[PDB]
Every structure is written in structure tokens, then in C-alpha cells.
């Protein structure tokens, strides 16, 4: 075992590896969305910028978990990163609806990992999740839900989607 | 009585205590509205900000009356602040209509207070009302009237509401 | 349910509405004290400034709970804010003893809310309480206890009260 | 009549000349106190500075009434300024009690002048009194009442008087 390992359960080590892959998959989804919105027949640069930033942050989130794995003396095991569920994301509202679902899928995973850490009496790990993940996840879900409501108000299609796009830019 | 009290009628003292409560009530109503417009299914950030600011101003007007009561040798007697009439305020137009009616209700009470002070020959209090309250009240009522007209022109629902809310940001 | 709600128990939602009202009530108690100490026959501006700041802090804490209700998809329910039963606060020491009792009362309710959140496996809400509420509450209680001891040493009536008040300003 | 006189009643003109003399008399009373508190066997420099400033303020108020007489086309009639009957002012508290009595005496006369102006339908003169005289007068009376209460708390003789004086400097 690692010279640094102390009070680090192998179930928590395994779940951290699962989370690393999930964060990376989410980064891939938002990368796909970002360049979809730069197609010459889509051309929503506000949405595109929103999802590039989203993609960048998910990748930083994955790296924080990799760095965390090493800090506790666990071993990073990287798996294939699945292809995004879609190539083409449709309207702005549909991409936001997919992003809301993905964020809540990641949040449930984060909450399950917290329950695993709690049951294994790992307060260093529960503190990591509460500090660096569960807070941003809740604010992220709130922000996308707000944006869906505003987009439905503005449009959601036609002139409204055009005017809404200018606010994410 | 007070070592300071001079030409201060007990009817004026009591009406000041009523006005303190009314200002605090108005502040509470506007706080309710402000966080209503931050609901994920409402998401009107300009309306939210407008009513937050209105709430703060009302609490400041209440505090000016409390300071005033002490200046004149009267005794502040605080009363229960009633729950806001609504928990949910509907559209941005419906909230503005509620606000206009509230602003005209407060204005009527302030004018009755001015009548009471004038009838008790208290020019220090009539001056207070004219400088610190009556002016802002008329400006506030004209502003909300302007807003109701603009929002009816833009919308008042859908894209016009989305666009008008940007102007309160 | 709210499009954003996830892992948010109805008991925690109800408890947060309860807590908003108690922070607003505390705000009102400190507002009462603040202007009591500006009476011409009391004239303790340091105490007045201390309790004014306490009033603002409690109102900010109430609003953070309202923001929190909205973040999680709960619905804010605002209720009447009762007036303090005894607004004749007495000496600075008696007001400080009342403040300490109130701070501990709020602290007990916050711990009960922590226990409800914990029992419902809500680490997002326990994180909020530890960071935004329980830390300040222990610091507040310690600060007021210090003040009570310092004022009993100085005074707590006459010249000692006069001098202690000046170190509060 | 004066080429500028318009809507200026002779009773208001006479009352303003009366008021100039009373502000000048008040100035003289505070000048007496100011140098009384610089006696080597009194030695209260904070009180001395307070009453010196009060003396200057009263003289400025007298001169604003003289300017006002000229603005309206009335004719300034200056009369003898009586000396204070008792220039042995006693403790700081006794001087403060004398100041409060004087401030209220001046306030009553100003309200009588407001009533004369109002009865003669002179809104220019009621505007002058509310803005330039009645506001400062209530603020002065409140400030002195506060001071009396603070000095009674601190002292009002011995070390408390010594310390209160230093907070006045
Ligand atoms: Fe994440
Ligand atoms: Fe107001
Ligand atoms: Fe609090
Ligand atoms: Fe004067």
C-alpha cells in the first residue's frame, strides 16, 4: 500500500475513479455541444461560449479528482470516455434540457460518493465533496434551470432564441 | 415626558408608530417579490433587483421614522409585521400593479399623517414628510407607472417581458 | 416538483422557512434595541451601533436562507414577524444578556436544522449550516459573553457603562 | 415701500427683528459659558469648545435673519443685547441644563414666528424657518438631552465630568 494511505477505503478509491470518468464524459458532452453551436447552419455563439466554458470546468473537475486520488494514496485507473449521446443537439432549449439532465446525473453520482465516504467514516472525503463539488453542482443546476425558464419566456425558438443567445455571449 | 419633547402631539407620536409598521410591511412585501423573481421557474433578475432595492429603501424609510420618534421625545412602539399579502406574485406586470397600489396606499397614509401634523400645528413634522417621504413617494409612483406602460408596450408576456426585465438590471 | 429539486426533503424545506422567520424575528429584536439605545434618556451610541449591526447581520442571514430555498427548488413561505414582547430593554448589560439568550436560542434551532438535514442525508444543507450559520453563531456567543464580562468588570452601571459604551463605538 | 417688498407683512418684519435680538442674546450666553469653562479654576476645555461653537452658530443664525430682512425689503432694527443675568454657570451639567432651557426658549419663539408667517400666508418665510431654523433646533435639543443623559451616567461630578469633557474635545 501507499506510504501515504491512511483511512482510505478501496470502495472510495474505486468510486473516485468512476467519478473521474464521469466528469471527463461530461466535459466531452459540452465540447460536442460547443462546436455544434458553431455550425454555419446553427450559429449560436452565446450557447457555444457557454458550453466551451462548461466543458473546460468539467475537465478541471476531473483533474481535481485525479489529484485527490494521488493525495490519499489511491491509484488512478482511466477508462474509455464514452461518445456523447448525440452528435447534433437540436435547438438551444433542447441542449439546455440535456445539460440539466446531465448535471443532475453527475450530482446524484456525487451524492452517492458522499454516502459511500460517510459510511466508511472518511471525513476528509466528505469535506472534499462538500467543498469542491456539491456546491458548484447545485449552483450549476440552478443556473441552467433559470436559463431554461428565460429561454421559454423569450422564445424558445425564433427571434427569442436569437435575443437570448446574446446574453450568454 | 421627555427632556426634549416640545410641540409634539401624542396623536402625531402614535401615527408615526403606525407609519413605521407600514414601511416595514412594505419592505417585507418587496422582499417577498424580490425572491419570488429569483425562483428557478420565474427567473426575472431585473424585477428581482428592482424589488430588492425597493425593499431596502422601505426599511430605510422606516428607520428614518424611528430616528424621528426619538428626536422629538416620542416612544417607539413596534408592532408585528404582517405576512405579505401573497406568497406568489404572478407575472412581472401583476407584481408592478401590486407595487403601484402599495405605493399609493403608503402615499395616502403619509398624506393623512401630514394632515394630522398640520392640524396639530407641527411644522417640523410637516417639513419632515415633505422632504423625506412625499417627494420620493410621487417619484416612485410615476416610475412604476412608466414601467407598467413600457411593459404593456413590450409584452406584457413572452419576449417583451424577457426584454423589459433586461432594462431593470 | 421544481426542475432543479434533487435530494431536498420536505422537512428540510419546511425547517428552512421556519428558520427564515426566526432570523427575521432576531433582526427585529436587534432593531428594537438599536433605536432604544438612541433614546435621549438612554444615550448609549456604542450599544446602538452594535445592535444595529446585529440587526443587519440577522437580516442578511434570513436572505441567505431565502436564496438557499430557491437554489434547492423549495418554495419560500413568509409569515408574520412578531414584535418583541418587551421593548424596554434596560441597561446595556440587560440588553447584552437578552442578546446572549437570543443567540443561543437561534443556535439551538440551527443545530436542530443540522440534525434534520443530517437525518435526511442532505450534505449540501449540512455544509451550508456549518459554513454560513454555525461558525458565526459560536463566534457571536463568545463575543457577547466577553462583552458581558468586560461590562461587569467596568461597571455595569454609571461610569463603567459610559466607558464601555465608548469602546463599542 | 422697498422696490422689492412683496407679500411681506409688517408683523413678520417686526417678529424677525425680535428674533435677530434673541439669536444674538443666545450667542452672548454661549460666549459667556465658553470662556467660563476656560477659567483656571474650572478647566473644562471640551465644554468650552462646545459652547464656543454654539456661540458662533447663534451669531450665524442672527446674520441669516438679517440677510433675510434685506432680501424681503424689511428694515433691520438692532437693539441692545442684554448680558446674561447669571454668568457663574456652575458644573458642566448645570451649563448643559441652562443650554437646553435656552434652546427650547429659542425653539418656542421660532414656532411662534412660523405661526405668524403662516397666519399671514407667507410661504417664503415658513420655508425659511423650517429649513434654516426649526430643523437645527430639534437636532440641537436632542443632542443636548443626549449629553445631559451621558454626563449623568458618567459623573456628573468628579472623574465622570473629567472623562465626559475629554469626549467633547
Ligand atoms: Fe462535477
Ligand atoms: Fe417610504
Ligand atoms: Fe442569524
Ligand atoms: Fe439660533
Amino acid at each position: 500500500a501507499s506510504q501515504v494511505r491512511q483511512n482510505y477505503h478501496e470502495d472510495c478509491e474505486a468510486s473516485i475513479n468512476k467519478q473521474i470518468n464521469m466528469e471527463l464524459y461530461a466535459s466531452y458532452v459540452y465540447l460536442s455541444m460547443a462546436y455544434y453551436f458553431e455550425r454555419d447552419d446553427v450559429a449560436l455563439p452565446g450557447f457555444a461560449k457557454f458550453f466551451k466554458e462548461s466543458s473546460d470546468e468539467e475537465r478541471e473537475h476531473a483533474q481535481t479528482f485525479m489529484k485527490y486520488q494521488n493525495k490519499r494514496g489511491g491509484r488512478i485507473v482511466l477508462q474509455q470516455i464514452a461518445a456523447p449521446s448525440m452528435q447534433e443537439w437540436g435547438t438551444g432549449l433542447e441542449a439546455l434540457q440535456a445539460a440539466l439532465d446531465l448535471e443532475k446525473q453527475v450530482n446524484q453520482s456525487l451524492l452517492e460518493l458522499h454516502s459511500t465516504a460517510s459510511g466508511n467514516n472518511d471525513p476528509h472525503l466528505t469535506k472534499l465533496l462538500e467543498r469542491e463539488y456539491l456546491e458548484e453542482q447545485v449552483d450549476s443546476i440552478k443556473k441552467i434551470g433559470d436559463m431554461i425558464t428565460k429561454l421559454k419566456r423569450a422564445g424558445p425558438t425564433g427571434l427569442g432564441e436569437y435575443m437570448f443567445d446574446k446574453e450568454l455571449n
Side-chain angles (χ1 to χ4, degrees), chain A residues 22-162:
Chain A
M22 197 173 212
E23 308 289 339
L24 289 171
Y25 169 74
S27 188
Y28 203 15
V29 173
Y30 295 134
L31 188 68
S32 179
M33 285 180 183
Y35 286 87
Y36 169 83
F37 285 111
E38 299 203 326
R39 292 169 46 157
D40 76 273
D41 57 354
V42 178
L44 289 156
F47 284 92
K49 174 161 155 67
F50 179 78
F51 287 115
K52 299 194 186 198
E53 291 174 353
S54 304
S55 177
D56 285 343
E57 281 162 14
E58 291 310 296
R59 200 185 81 110
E60 304 277 21
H61 269 330
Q63 295 187 250
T64 296
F65 272 129
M66 294 167 73
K67 169 176 86 157
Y68 186 85
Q69 187 74 275
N70 277 337
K71 272 190 191 171
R72 298 296 302 277
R75 290 298 165 242
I76 303 167
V77 172
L78 299 172
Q79 304 166 121
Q80 179 167 289
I81 301 165
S85 68
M86 304 285 287
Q87 302 292 338
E88 299 176 332
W89 297 99
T91 70
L93 177 56
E94 296 181 308
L96 292 175
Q97 275 151 346
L100 176 63
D101 177 74
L102 174 63
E103 294 294 301
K104 298 177 72 184
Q105 289 171 26
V106 173
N107 201 36
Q108 184 59 220
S109 188
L110 296 172
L111 289 163
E112 273 152 10
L113 179 33
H114 189 284
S115 194
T116 303
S118 293
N120 289 125
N121 305 118
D122 194 333
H124 190 271
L125 180 41
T126 59
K127 173 222 193 320
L128 168 84
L129 296 159
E130 300 172 21
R131 183 183 77 251
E132 311 236 333
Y133 290 102
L134 297 186
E135 184 72 15
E136 298 99 295
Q137 211 67 23
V138 154
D139 295 343
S140 194
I141 298 164
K142 175 60 154 68
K143 177 212 261 169
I144 289 154
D146 284 9
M147 291 163 69
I148 289 172
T149 293
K150 301 167 154 185
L151 183 49
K152 289 181 184 187
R153 174 177 289 107
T157 67
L159 171 60
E161 184 188 50
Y162 171 86

